[PDB]
Design a protein around this ligand. Structure first.
Ligand SMILES: CCCSc1nc(N[C@@H]2C[C@H]2c2ccc(F)c(F)c2)c2nnn([C@@H]3C[C@H](OCCO)[C@@H](O)[C@H]3O)c2n1
Lengths: 216, 210
């Protein structure tokens, strides 16, 4: 009952993106799959949909000569391909599975969404530094994720074993044109001497993952 | 075009309503669904087939549909209901999904909370990479608006400062972050750095001495 999507990447104006959407249960059954985008800070916009079990598909009129939707049964993955990318195509591309078994259908299971950035600027992976806990900082500790492009960066702690007290901040866009962010976690002070803390930083646009040890 | 008011507001525990207005081609001859988008998250289905709730959705959410109009009602409004709500519909003649513009729900009169300030000096790793960044974390405050100012010793520093717009923590209070990037001549000369946070006219300042 989960739809899986990546981070995910950087495109020059005029190029194309293929956004992937994988069903966790190994089937689309007779449900529909839809693609919905959202430009940063703006509304939702429907792009297209398909009922994989039947191959029946439709795309938004505003994207008919630019959008192609398809479904791969072998890996229960749906794909949307948007061509002729423009600055205005920078958006998070969500995939959502329908509620109706094929007409009162709705978008019931949503993916995390993939951010597509349309820009001529080059990709840059992050530099990750520890924000070590001390008597000066329960204790706060974290990771500083510096100077990367484009967004996003995701941060997990101890490969997902640490979720309580985690706060990942939005990124800051510096004068240089590069982003930076920090992820912080509040932990029992005693845990500082009983366990290790590793922040796992994922920068899907540069296909980079950094696992950074954070020591007191 | 399906329309919604851009915003709606009420105090905690109060009832709020959001209406979606469309045409005979979309809402008029179809069904309306409603989506909740909490800050920094994917949309979530609240209501489908006009008035049905998926399992797990609080019963404080209800839906209704009359002609070319549809309404989402939220009873006993909580801080955790602050989000953007969208109505969704299908127009069979165009075989296309349509969304309303979205309505931002604000929960007014929440309890005030002064910020706590945590300041990290540059890591030995970054210093070894010939760079120096101080990280100021501002947390547990309400309302979600602060001004952050830095000092190096007693000197105000504007260059090299970057600050995030506050966003909610899991406990519904706000947090923000601020960064001070330093030159090697600033790091070799200053004995202390300070992150000054102004919230509702009062200031909380934390100092670090490397
Ligand atoms: C051909 C396109 C197949 S996907 C599809 N999806 C329908 N409902 C969409 C999910 C619900 C929806 C609700 C709110 C939104 F904001 C949103 F973006 C999406 C849907 N409803 N009717 N149809 C028919 C089925 C028929 O397929 C032909 C099979 O031979 C075609 O006439 C569609 O209009 C839907 N198709």
């Amino acid at each position: 009952v989960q739809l899986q999507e990546s981070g995910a990447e950087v495109k020059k104006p005029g190029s194309s993106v293929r956004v992937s959407c994988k069903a966790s249960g190994g089937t689309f059954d007779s449900y529909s799959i839809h693609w919905v985008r959202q430009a940063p800070g703006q509304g939702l916009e429907w792009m297209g949909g398909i009922i994989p079990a039947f191959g029946t598909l439709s795309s938004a009129q505003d994207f008919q000569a630019r959008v192609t939707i398809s479904a791969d049964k072998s890996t229960s993955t749906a794909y949307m391909e948007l061509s002729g990318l423009r600055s205005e195509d920078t958006a998070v591309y969500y995939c959502a599975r329908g509620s109706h078994l094929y007409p009162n259908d709705a978008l019931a299971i949503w993916g995390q969404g993939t951010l597509v950035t349309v820009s001529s600027a080059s990709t840059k992976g992050p530099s990750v530094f520890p924000l070590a806990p001390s008597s000066k900082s329960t204790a706060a500790l974290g990771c500083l994720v510096k100077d990367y492009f484009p967004e996003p960066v995701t941060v997990s702690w101890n490969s997902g074993a640490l979720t309580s007290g985690v706060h990942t901040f939005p990124a800051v866009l510096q004068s240089s044109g590069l982003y930076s962010l920090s992820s912080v976690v509040t932990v029992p002070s005693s845990s500082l001497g009983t366990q290790t803390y590793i922040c796992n930083v994922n920068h899907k646009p540069s296909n980079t993952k950094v696992d950074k040890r954070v020591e007191p | 075009v399906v329309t919604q008011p851009p915003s709606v507001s009420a105090a905690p525990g109060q009832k709020v309503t959001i209406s979606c207005s469309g045409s005979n081609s979309d809402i008029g001859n179809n069904y309306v669904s409603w989506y909740q988008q909490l800050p920094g998250t994917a949309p979530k289905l609240l209501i489908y087939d006009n008035n049905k709730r998926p399992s797990g959705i609080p019963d404080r959410f209800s839906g209704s549909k009359s002609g070319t109009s549809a309404t989402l009602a939220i009873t006993g409004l909580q801080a955790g209901d602050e989000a953007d709500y969208y109505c969704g519909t299908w127009d069979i003649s165009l075989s296309a999904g349509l969304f309303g513009g979205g309505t931002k729900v604000t929960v007014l009169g929440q309890p005030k909370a002064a910020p706590s300030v945590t300041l990290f000096p540059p890591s030995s790793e970054e210093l070894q990479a010939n760079k120096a960044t101080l990280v100021c974390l501002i947390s547990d405050f309400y309302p979600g608006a602060v001004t952050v100012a830095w000092k190096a010793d007693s000197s105000p520093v504007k260059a090299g400062v970057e600050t995030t717009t506050p966003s909610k923590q899991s406990n519904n209070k706000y947090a923000a972050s601020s960064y001070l990037s330093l030159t090697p001549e600033q790091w070799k000369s200053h004995r202390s750095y300070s992150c000054q946070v102004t919230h509702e006219g009062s200031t909380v300042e934390k100092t670090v001495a490397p």
